[PDB]
A and B are shown apart, each in its own frame.
Chain A
Amino acid sequence: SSLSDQLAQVASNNATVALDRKRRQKLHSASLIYNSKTAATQDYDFIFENASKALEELSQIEPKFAIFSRTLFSESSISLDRNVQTKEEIKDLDNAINAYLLLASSKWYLAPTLHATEWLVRRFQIHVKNTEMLLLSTLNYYQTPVF
């Protein structure tokens, strides 16, 4: 194989790491609520606090989201970076993300689940890391703007 092929492989491996400001902007402007110019200027604290509000709304609708408030939506997860822990911690949080996605697959018609999984999109990069489970979970909604 060729050098550009092997480098496309290392780009696909390092897809989520922000190695300068321009890649961080292009990578953090990928939101599910806001457009790119607002989404690039938002913080982690802002999107976390309104995603925690939306998870409280989603949890009082369906009470199986409270353990996701315990682990995936806690305040240690504001500073938890995805691509800094090993493969075993990665598989732990990726089956956490799979649990959240196949729990909240049914709830996709009501905006608290959009504002709640906004934080999985922007903190844990599940649109590019945990992407097969995201497509498979929301496959039903294909005539809808959320898909």
Chain B
Amino acid sequence: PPPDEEEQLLAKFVFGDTTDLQENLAKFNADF
């Protein structure tokens, strides 16, 4: 049982995952 990138993408859609949202809010750092 490996992971998968397309599976984890639409799994993040289906389970309502804001993990990448909080990652981007912590990451974006006002770089412009």
Residues on A facing B (Cβ under 8 Å): 64, 67, 70-72, 74, 76-77, 79-80, 85, 89, 92-93, 95-96, 98-99, 103
**Inter-chain contacts of A77 with B (CB < 8 A):** 18, 21
- In the complex, which residue of chain B has the Cβ closest to the Cβ of A94? B25
CA distance in complex: A12, B30 (Å): 29
Contact in complex: B22, A70 (CB < 8 Å)? no
- Number of B positions contacting A (CB below 8 A): 13
Other-chain residue from A64, A71, A99 in contact with B21 (beta carbon distance below 8 A): A71
Give 27 pairs: A residue, B residue, CB < 8 Å, sorted on A: A67-B32, A70-B28, A71-B21, A71-B25, A71-B28, A72-B25, A74-B21, A74-B24, A76-B16, A76-B20, A76-B21, A77-B18, A79-B16, A79-B18, A80-B18, A80-B21, A85-B22, A89-B22, A89-B25, A92-B22, A92-B25, A92-B26, A93-B25, A96-B28, A99-B28, A99-B32, A103-B32
**Inter-chain contacts of B32 with A (CB < 8 A):** 64, 67, 99, 103
- In the complex, which residue of chain B has the Cβ closest to the Cβ of A80? B18
Q: How far is the CB of B27 from chain A (nearest CB, A)?
A: 8
- In the complex, which residue of chain B has the Cβ closest to the Cβ of A92? B25
Q: How far is the CB of A123 from chain B (nearest CB, A)?
A: 13
User: Most chain-A Cβ atoms within 10 A of its Cβ — which of B25, B28, B31?
Assistant: B25
